[PDB]
Amino acid sequence: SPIQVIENDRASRGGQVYATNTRGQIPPLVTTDCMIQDQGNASPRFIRCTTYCFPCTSDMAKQAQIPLAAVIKPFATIPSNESPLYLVNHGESGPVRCNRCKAYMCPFMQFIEGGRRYQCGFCNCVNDVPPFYFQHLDHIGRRLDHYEKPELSLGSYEYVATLDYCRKSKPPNPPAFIFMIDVSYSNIKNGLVKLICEELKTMLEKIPKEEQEETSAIRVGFITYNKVLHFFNVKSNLAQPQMMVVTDVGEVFVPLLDGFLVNYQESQSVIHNLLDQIPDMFADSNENETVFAPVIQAGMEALKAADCPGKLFIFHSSLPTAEAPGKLKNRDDKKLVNTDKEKILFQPQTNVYDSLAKDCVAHGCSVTLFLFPSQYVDVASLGLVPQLTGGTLYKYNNFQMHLDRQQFLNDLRNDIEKKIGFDAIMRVRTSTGFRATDFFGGILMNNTTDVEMAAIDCDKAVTVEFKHDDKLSEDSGALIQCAVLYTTISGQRRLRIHNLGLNCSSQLADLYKSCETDALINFFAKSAFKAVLHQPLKVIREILVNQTAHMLACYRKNCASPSAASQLILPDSMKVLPVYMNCLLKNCVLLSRPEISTDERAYQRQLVMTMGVADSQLFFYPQLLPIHTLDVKSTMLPAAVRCSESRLSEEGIFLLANGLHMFLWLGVSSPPELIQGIFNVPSFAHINTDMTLLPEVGNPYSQQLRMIMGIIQQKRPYSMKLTIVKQREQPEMVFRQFLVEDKGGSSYVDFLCCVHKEICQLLN
């Protein structure tokens, strides 16, 4: 079971300090909370790997078929007790770099010849150190100030970027938040429009600002639309906002400069005067058709006029059908199993959404779409721009005010206050022996080499794949340096560097000893999810199973102690690799037509692509907590239980959450005592599933259940949609879709015996 592993690693490593001083050290599991101190290598909160010990020969990599990858969360939220990142400045010369591989100054560069010159680990080239940075030595190859300067002893730090890194070699401008609202009949009726306006007044105050300044430099603009764009002039001196309506959709243009993007604190009374009227303005609107791509095309051109990056907060209702560039038809069609062209269902209908996405990223424009579907919406097409741009997609199926209100406002407060950078580019440099060849995440690329992110937050993550090049060296090992150049919310060019060393090995045993199952799944999930747009689903599913079997067959065949021909020998690191793999193969994204909406398939496919390992572990193996057993006035953590219907009692109550939904399950024999202390109603048959809002009445349990619900939501970016479920013949048919160790694909004992039948096919 996965539970037995998680607790076994929580016991040996939890509550202890993990110091990253060893070269090829193996960090704990994501589930295991432990204090981290940055010595040498970067923290696993920033970057984890599939294997912390690479093979040395490319032929050996083909033998084990173990993927060499890493999951980088470059702006992960460092805890309050862990030491923060240090900012480094190398003056006018800019950060010191190698003259061959262009790698930045890091602890991996040994100083020699009296500190006069240094040799790069990545290429081994030697650079005469700039004199200002020179003149420091130690008895044994240690800069005297080696400890003082963070770029010489830490693995995570930030550089100050000179002007030759910026666009047009000129200092950048602060970004801008452009809020754009759909105002068709769909959102006027369900009361969403006035909600956005009323609650925007509150959270415009909370737009991020730095400690060094006293007021956020982020300016703010406003637009509404329904097949026709409505611009707003909210300059500081106006007592009344001006509206400029554009109908030339197709050759869209921005009709205004200086009546747009004004500092919120300056035009406060003017913006609030607008936010009170927009609800009243479109109340009697009967328009139902709307545009979409011209809205993004407009917000992009507005950011180019002010010559600054920005983030588009788009709120949309239903499918865009109005005649315009980006018009979406209803293209859902019987085309998935062995279709060989099912990949079209996961791709944008028109060819322009890719070109619009390219234009946005080039000008540092990000879009975060808040989608409120009530019918088919084509997530594959709408979400392509807010995914290629590094934004987020918030989808709320069949929005109802008395229910999903709190869920949406919690996600809007979250995406505004996110520590976000802009106009970012990533570049993963490696030592002589390998290079980065493929990339996964919300990103766009032109050069094989560079990853471009219009905006990146603390929750995004990129998964990088490595392929062997020439031969690795057992003495040096394998080195990784990730560099993210970007722009701050105060408009300052800044680099962030992550350095991670790993050790090579000529022995196949050390390969499997140093595997993280949580990270292996993150790569495999994204890997399949990207090939969905190219190859049939049954083809990809064969690739996943065969590679998993070939991995557990090479450990068995090549170096495993001789065991019986009825046993499956798996190492400690890959104890749960088959279970997790079988859960990824049961996710709806790789499944058939019946009972699964394509938009939910496209929605889940986008969500995983941006996942950090920590998240990927929860979305695929949910957490199941039994509540009835929990004893009041007890330590808060209740141990998780295996994910199956078997570990449930009719009597029992459980909590399930994968990071996006949260289910409160109730057995038919659930004790009426707990039901009264939580649901305020006497019996089990007195609960209404449709009234799934936060209940507050209670003193021992309704405070206890609400306490454990809060700690679960804590480390999770998306605020989970609560779904209360009764046992017999209720909408639990959806609840069983997350009990991933249940059949519903093959089972666990079958997949094990499946791995073993190809364990013996690779005769050895």
């Binding site: 409505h230 611009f231 009344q240 906002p241 001006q242 509206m243 400029m244 309506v245 554009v246 109908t247 030339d248 050759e251 243009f253 009709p255 400069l257 200086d258 009227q277 303005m281």
Partner: protein
């Protein structure tokens, strides 16, 4: 007297024919040398006339449809009337029961030759005024234009509908009646649009809207919006002209009224402050290196924006004309604005064309409020949706028309094969007309003939009316009554009617051959109507009826109308605009300016336009229709520079200066295009304006030597 006949028939019927006695044969009319033509003023002011208030009676024959007029013979006991054009018998409507020999209806009395009827058409439409304002100007000119636009808004009747389109780098269509907010639809200043496209983009149905709303309803909102109107925010770099999209904005103003209120009276009043720099309708490049088109630049094929530019505004004109709307242009700038391209818009519709220096001038502010001149009853002096129908006797066919009109191509028996100017029709459409509007109708031949002029229009009170003027002139046998025909020659009218043709040819594909032709006809005229022994130049004598004609031709061929290489293209298009519009009295002043002389010895007296009238002890007052010039003689200039005027002894001298200035202030209130005033004297920098107004037949030559090469050629 025949001079009494011309003046009485002009004040009564509003017409002035080149010949008031017509030849009965087609051949001798061809050799007359001046075609039978007439200046016609359909709505010539007639305080005396009272509108009838009953439908006109028309001949029952379909192709005739002439109005009941005094020329029709009436059998009162039989209650019938014979239409004098087609001799058809017609009955009287039942309301005409009590018609008698002594209580006949008004339309049969000779005095009421021309009369106006009140049409019971049925739709009393409100007037429509659409403002199209340029924002690419300084705050001074804009703040005054804002002051002037609110003044016009205060005069419009309460039921009229108003609209506002502001254009700069982009075009804006404001929605009036916006409450607690102001919203305005915006369009690219680089793309043209159709009427259907704007109908769908603005959200409108086919055939009060949100853009055109009553005056009594939006006065508070509009006078607040015009006050808050600031200039074009888009800054202009160095050496560049502001990105002004004049042609695009006018197209939207045309299309807006085309899909909301078509086939009804309206005025598109576009105020511009400079040339159009952003097409379509582009006039000049945005960079200030490239200068404005010059009559030389345009003659060397060096104006890459004229052909495409005029073509654009030429299509907007026929769109607004066919729909029935009026395009006004109020261009005030320090350089040309594109009037040569945009001339077609206020020339085909009966719109105005006002040229000036800036809007902050008392020149413009006065001229603009003259447009809103009310009658005594309190209604504007404008007329909209004019349909001019002309019928002639079977021996007469219409060649064509020159002036503010558009052909309806109404083929009929009164349409001649050989058409002149705007021809091939007996029906024209004048979108906007005033009591001053005057057309030139040209006729042809193949007991007295008859011509009837029917004009239907919308009165500014909304009322639908028809103006009918019927006139008749006696036929003649030219082989016996040459004296009877030459006695009817209107030398004044024939001078303007011929000038009317010569200018229309200057618009036309023809070059300086107009000078060669204008002299050939003058030679032909003097050859036929002059008493002389051949080859004796001194023997040549004019009849007094023809005396002033060779002098009129002299001042015409030398005027600014045919010699454009001394003015700018926007100026030449302006002068020609007003000449094709005025009646006889003003058109003569245009060709041959009046001149007055003020002296101690004698009251003010007119004098010849030669240097022989310029004296040292005399003050001169020139009056070309476009400018007033007061000239002080050398002796009077000295007495003026010394200061004798203040001294109470010279009460006589201080009054001598006030006599021309007081009469100058008179003409600066009555004349609708307020002229440019000039206070110069002997040796002033502005004295050039008077000295200039004072094979081919002849080059630039004095009046006397022009008469001599006319004499020696008329006798050969």
């Amino acid at each position: 007297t025949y001079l009494e006949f011309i003046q009485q028939n002009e004040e009564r019927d509003g017409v002035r024919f080149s010949w008031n006695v017509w030849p009965s044969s087609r051949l001798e009319a061809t050799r007359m040398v001046v075609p039978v033509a007439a200046l016609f003023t359909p709505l010539k002011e007639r305080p005396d006339l009272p509108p009838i208030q009953y439908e006109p009676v028309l001949c029952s024959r379909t192709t005739c449809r002439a109005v009941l007029n005094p020329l029709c013979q009436v059998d009162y006991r039989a209650k019938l009337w014979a239409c004098n054009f087609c001799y058809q018998r017609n009955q009287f409507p039942p309301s005409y029961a009590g018609i008698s020999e002594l209580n006949q209806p008004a339309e049969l009395l000779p005095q009421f030759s021309s009369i106006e009827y009140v049409v019971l058409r049925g739709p009393q439409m409100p007037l429509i005024f659409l403002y199209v304002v340029d924002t690419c100007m300084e705050d001074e000119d804009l703040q005054a234009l804002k002051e002037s636009m609110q003044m016009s808004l205060s005069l419009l009747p309460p039921t009229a509908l108003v609209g506002l389109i502001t254009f700069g780098r982009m075009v804006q269509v404001h929605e009036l009646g916006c409450e607690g907010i102001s919203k305005s639809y915006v369009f690219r200043g680089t793309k043209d649009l159709s009427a259907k496209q704007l109908q769908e983009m603005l959200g409108l149905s086919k055939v009060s809207n949100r853009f055109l709303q009553p005056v009594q309803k939006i006065d508070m909102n509009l006078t607040d919006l015009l006050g808050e109107l600031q200039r074009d925010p888009w800054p202009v770099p160095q050496g560049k002209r502001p990105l002004r999209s004049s042609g695009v904005a006018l197209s939207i103003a045309v299309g807006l009224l085309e899909c909301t209120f078509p086939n009804t009276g309206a005025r598109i009043m576009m105020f511009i402050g400079g040339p159009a720099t952003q097409g379509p309708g582009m006039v000049v490049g945005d960079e200030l290196k490239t200068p404005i088109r010059s009559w030389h630049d345009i003659d060397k094929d060096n104006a890459k924006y004229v052909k495409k530019g005029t073509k654009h505004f030429e299509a907007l004109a026929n769109r607004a004309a066919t729909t029935g709307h009026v395009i006004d242009i109020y261009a005030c700038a320090l350089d040309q604005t594109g009037l040569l391209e945009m001339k077609c818009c206020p020339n085909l519709t009966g719109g105005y064309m006002v040229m000036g220096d800036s809007f902050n001038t008392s020149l413009f502010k006065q001229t603009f409020q003259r447009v809103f001149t009310k009658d005594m009853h309190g209604q504007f002096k404008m007329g909209f949706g004019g349909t001019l129908e002309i019928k002639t006797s079977r021996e007469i066919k219409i060649s064509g028309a020159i002036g503010p009109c558009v052909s309806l191509n109404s083929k009929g028996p009164c349409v001649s094969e050989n058409e002149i100017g705007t021809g091939g029709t007996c029906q024209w459409k004048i979108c906007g007309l005033s009591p001053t509007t005057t057309l030139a109708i040209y006729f042809e031949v193949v007991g007295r003939g008859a011509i009837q002029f029917v004009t239907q229009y919308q009165h500014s009170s909304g009322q639908r009316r028809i103006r009918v003027t019927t006139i008749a002139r006696n036929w003649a046998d030219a082989q016996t009554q040459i004296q009877n025909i030459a006695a009817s020659f209107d030398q004044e009218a024939a001078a303007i009617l011929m000038a009317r043709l010569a200018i229309y040819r200057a618009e036309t594909e023809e070059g300086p051959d107009v000078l060669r032709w204008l002299d050939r006809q003058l030679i032909r005229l003097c050859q036929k109507f002059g008493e002389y022994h051949k080859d004796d130049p001194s023997s040549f004598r004019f009849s007094e009826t023809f005396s002033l004609y060779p002098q009129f031709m002299f001042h015409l061929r030398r005027s600014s109308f045919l010699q454009v290489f001394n003015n700018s293209p926007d100026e030449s298009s302006y002068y020609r605009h007003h000449f094709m519009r005025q009646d006889l009295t003003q058109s003569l002043i245009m060709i041959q300016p009046i001149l007055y002389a003020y002296s101690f010895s004698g009251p003010p007296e007119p004098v010849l336009l030669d240097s022989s009238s310029i004296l040292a002890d005399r003050i001169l007052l020139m009056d070309t229709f476009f400018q007033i010039l007061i000239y002080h003689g050398e002796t009077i200039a000295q007495w003026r520079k010394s200061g004798y005027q203040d001294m109470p002894e010279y009460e006589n001298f201080r009054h001598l200066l006030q006599a021309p200035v007081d009469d100058a202030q008179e003409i600066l209130h009555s004349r609708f295009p307020m002229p440019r005033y000039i206070d110069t004297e002997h040796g002033g920098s502005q004295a050039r304006f008077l000295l200039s107004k004072v094979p081919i037949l002849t080059d630039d030559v004095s009046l006397q030597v022009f008469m001599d090469h006319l004499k020696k050629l008329a006798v050969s």
